[model samples]
Target: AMMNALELQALRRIFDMTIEECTIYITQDNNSATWQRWEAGDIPISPEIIARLKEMKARRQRRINAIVDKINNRIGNNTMRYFPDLSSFQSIYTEGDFIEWKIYQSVAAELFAHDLERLC
Candidate 1:
């Protein structure tokens, strides 16, 4: 089934991302709107939705990197560290907030990669 395939692919991606120290968030953009942590195992996701999400995810990452870079440059270090937790944003989060969080994760992955690159 397309949903099964999409879930399988997403699970594989999430596993890989987790190993890299990145957290993942999965959301639905349908009438039954909701957001949740993507975990391993079977889930329900349409192929068309997954395809669209893949594109959005990439864009979200780009935005995250830009935001993180701005924060780092402004504070001269990991300013995000001072935030304590992302949950504080829950009250103020809009659709843009979700996009920014996705971006934040992407930026974090880049930072992780950069550190690993430096060690090599």
Candidate 2:
């Protein structure tokens, strides 16, 4: 199921931190093994986390892609002006990459929302 607005907001609060900030958080606690591995450049994410991460990625990608498609369609025969780098985006969601993934997600969503608002 998709995350509700409240759930999304709460998650944003928890996961929204820079790479350096995440490292600091991990260093502060021994229990932050997942985060520590993430800091060490290892993508040690579990299957369950991958599922949820993919869900969020899919939702964001769909919305962003739909907007891109509409713009491209209107420009008939013109090359796409903009599109998300799906591979680069997807790479952030590996195992133990929660903080990194969330950071990218927050930035992507913020940019998307800004563009969407301007379109209205």
Candidate 3:
């Protein structure tokens, strides 16, 4: 594999992610201390993990764009930036096939929860 130890470190640092983030997001089966071993080349990394790290930043950004489009088209413009999180997609999944309903139900989920809280 072309990936070396320092190269792994290069990927993580350039992405501005913590070892914790790298472990959780890119190498789902690994942990932070385990990452230390991988970082130092004391352990081997799965090539799939290497490929995942390669695509993680771009993939999340692309998702962010879609998520942004989903939100803004309905509400004119609201609050947002992005994390590589679910971004309210599943929170509103039952709403519809398209994601405008995604954003609406996402907002509704939050609002309804408060109503639910008071009812309880």
Candidate 4:
């Protein structure tokens, strides 16, 4: 389900709510708990939760943009390489998409770390 602008805004609000609630849960659990409570049907399914689910669809785009910006700054028109087209990094939605994004993030981070390590 593609989201419009207002829906995106609402999703962000829900993301914030989830973040806040998770912070609370972490604090309550002495900073060592999983989101098992939320997974186990403990958390309420309000508009906020729905929004959170919707917002996750775009999470990969956000992370990819951020990492791309960092890479662009580091490369700085050296001409050795260029950032890939944004379309290639498309937004995520499903659990499978999110898992793929997580793997991409890990690989991207590893590549960046290895490159930076050589520079250092």
lDDT of 2: 0.46
**lDDT by residue (tens digit), candidate 3, 21-114:** 6666566655888888888899787677777665654554565466556665675424432222344444535443322332333333443454
* lDDT ranking of the models: 3, 2, 1, 4
Q: Which residue pairs collide in model 3, if any?
A: none
* Deviation from truth (RMSD, Å), model 2: 13.2
Give the residue spans of candidate 4 off by over 4 A: 1-37, 41-44, 53-60, 69-120
Task: List TM-scores for all candidates, in order.
Answer: 0.38, 0.35, 0.45, 0.27
Superior by TM-score: candidate 2 or candidate 3:
3
Candidate 4 lands at a TM-score of: 0.27
lDDT of 1 by residue, 1-120 (tens): 343444545543532333222223433332222122223323455456567556656675666567656765674434232112356444345333544554454545555566421111
Residue 93 error, candidate 3, Å: 17
Give the per-residue lDDT digits (tens) of candidate 4, residues 25-79.
3233333133434443454334554564544546645655666667767855321
Across 3-104, the per-residue lDDT of candidate 2 in tens digits comes to: 343443344354464435434543333345555454353554445544554565566566567666676567543221221343554554344344445544
Best by TM-score: 3
**True-structure RMSD, every candidate:** 8.4, 13.2, 10.6, 13.9
Lowest lDDT block of 10, candidate 3? 111-120
**Steric clash count of candidate 3:** 0
